[PDB]
Design a protein around this ligand. Sequence first.
Ligand SMILES: O=C(O)C(=O)CC(=O)c1cccc(N(Cc2ccccc2)Cc2ccccc2)c1
Length: 283
Amino acid sequence: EMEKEFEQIDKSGSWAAIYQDIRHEASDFPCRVAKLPKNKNRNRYRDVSPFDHSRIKLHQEDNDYINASLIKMEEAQRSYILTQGPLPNTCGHFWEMVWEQKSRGVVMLNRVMEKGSLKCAQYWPQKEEKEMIFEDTNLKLTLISEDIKSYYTVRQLELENLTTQETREILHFHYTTWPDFGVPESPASFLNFLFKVRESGSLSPEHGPVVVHCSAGIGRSGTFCLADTCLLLMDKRKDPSSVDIKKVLLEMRKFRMGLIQTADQLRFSYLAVIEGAKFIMGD
Ligand SMILES: O=C(O)C(=O)CC(=O)c1cccc(N(Cc2ccccc2)Cc2ccccc2)c1
């Protein structure tokens, strides 16, 4: 099993070597729209841009920009929208995308503040008595219920389109225990988190693409999607041992850059898949 390859690389400390080879092999496409002047204040980092060909477009005649990408995995029959953590003035855009893409869940893999810095705006209401209104995009957001477990929190939210007045239930899966530095020592919690997300139906076909984000929506985000797809693939392929992470990862990077930003992240990704493989597809 890929577990062997894992141990091989480990026994060679060749992770940075493997990871670098991928960074080199990765796809590179234009981001002309993201780089436009008007969309300047709509981006978080200078080096985290969505390719033009796979960027999600807002349905507003004004400016249709938002730093988010549609990662479509054909064989796995899965889709994910990776985006950057919302900025003070892109929260309305964020939720508009959620609404227009008919998403069911939003996955947050970061904490509002990490290392004494803000990593994104408080884009969802913390108290049910105090809803949130995004005047620019005319959407109302209401906290229905929160469930704080030891490693993550899950929230039910009501999103209403003030224009039409239709209402939708959005699940917010927030992974709150990812460490400030490095990656988890054990993939255990991360996997239960993934499974809870699946169990909700947010990744399922009868719904729009789940919306995933982190700090740049590429570091931990990529890991979340890479692990999901790989497991799903070992789940349907006649030959599970034929699922190649390195291969799946590059397919994914054809839709958004920066998935897996470090070698430890990669190693960790391998771990997650391997362990998850056992727990799911038997040993
Ligand atoms: O948790 C994760 O995995 C992340 O994904 C974390 C992250 O939010 C994220 C994203 C983009 C960039 C960065 N910098 C910050 C910087 C950039 C430009 C100028 C000054 C500072 C690091 C850097 C990386 C690669 C090349 C060059 C720099 C962090």
